[PDB]
């Protein structure tokens, strides 16, 4: 599907796409619950995404995305989680939850949500903990069109079942989830997938976590070529964004 203008470098490093945002609650249910961000103006159904923090953090930890992804059009549900102390994998299972919880209420008449969204197609981001939890959805659900983790922590590191175009944003000098032991490692085991890195040099492991314009330049390309299979982010979504602070990118199984 092809949803919204022709994307320049520009439009996507701006504040926001062309879309204006509205956000409704999605109640607590097996998660500590959160706020869903959607395009008022799209024109046409959305795909989900489902956003989840990090050990110790709340929903503003990863509140960003939620308008810059929804202005480009999707349904952002950033989350809170049962508790803060929720390793990955509970991480994950909340995570899955509020994906199906969001489009459940794109078939209820009366959700704002109502005839908006699109079951079909959905993504998986997530910080840290919430990282390694979107990994493991990815691996789990694999019917998951894209996963965008941003300095992610996991106790394993093997990925290679995943089948899920998979873009790892890293913190060069993270010393929570340090990249030789947790980014690198989850990038290098992957190898059925496109797949990508991008790192932010000298960055701290909150390095993702307020809204760089490279950064959402790449989150939203990654989400419309793989969740929409809009084309014409192949080159958005694929290339090295020859940007200014950023000490690696790797890409692989990305084309054109």
Known sequence: VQIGPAPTKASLEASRGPFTVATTRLSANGHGGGTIYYPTN?????????????????????????PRLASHGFAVVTIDTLTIYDQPSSRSSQQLRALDQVVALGSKSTSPLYNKVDGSRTGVMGWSMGGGGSLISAQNRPSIKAAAPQAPWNTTSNFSSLTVPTLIFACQADVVAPILSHAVPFYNSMSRNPKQYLERTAGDHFCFNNANPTVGLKGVAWMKRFIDGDTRYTSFACSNPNALGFSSFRTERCSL
Not at 51 to 65: A, H, K, R, T
Request: zero cysteines; charged letters at 10%; aromatic letters at 16%.
């Open 42 to 66: 799209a024109g046409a159904k959305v795909g989900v995404i489902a956003i989840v923090p990090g050990y110790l953090s709340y929903q503003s930890s990863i509140e960003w995305w939620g």
